Ligand binder design. Structure first.
Ligand SMILES: CCCNc1cc(-c2ccc3c(ccn3CCCN(C)C)c2)nc(S(C)(=O)=O)n1
Length: 110
């Protein structure tokens, strides 16, 4: 996953993100969390991430490596499961959407 990203790669990456942004379980991860939404959220999580910031980032070719792309995506799943207890629907959203991301990510690697 260390090989530099090509222009063709970025097209693949854009679709993964749209695939993700359209998922019915992605609604808590589309935008940066609203501190009204989550009481103490920004005291708790040292590195928040959401799908608009990756979209911004892809757009701007922030990503030199798949490694770095998966890094950001996993941060969104990790943050939710850390901040949220195992039985929150937000946590279950993280479960559903991460396997989807792994399904889609497996598609891209091939
Ligand atoms: C009680 C703590 C629950 N914790 C949460 C809550 C949320 C959350 C809540 C509402 C939400 C969105 C997104 C839209 N809305 C609707 C209202 C949009 N505007 C700003 C008013 C997210 N996201 C996570 S998360 C990212 O999975 O960690 N955790």
């Amino acid at each position: 996953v260390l090989t530099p990203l090509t222009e063709k790669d970025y097209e693949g990456l854009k679709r993964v993100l749209r695939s993700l942004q359209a998922h019915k379980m992605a609604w808590p991860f589309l935008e940066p969390v609203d501190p009204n939404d989550a009481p103490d959220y920004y005291g708790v999580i040292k590195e928040p991430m959401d799908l608009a910031t990756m979209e911004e980032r892809v757009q701007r070719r922030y990503y030199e490596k798949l490694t770095e792309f998966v890094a950001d995506m996993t941060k969104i799943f990790d943050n939710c499961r850390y901040y949220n207890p195992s039985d929150s629907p937000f946590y279950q959203c993280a479960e559903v959407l991460e396997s989807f991301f792994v399904q889609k990510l497996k598609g891209f690697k091939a």
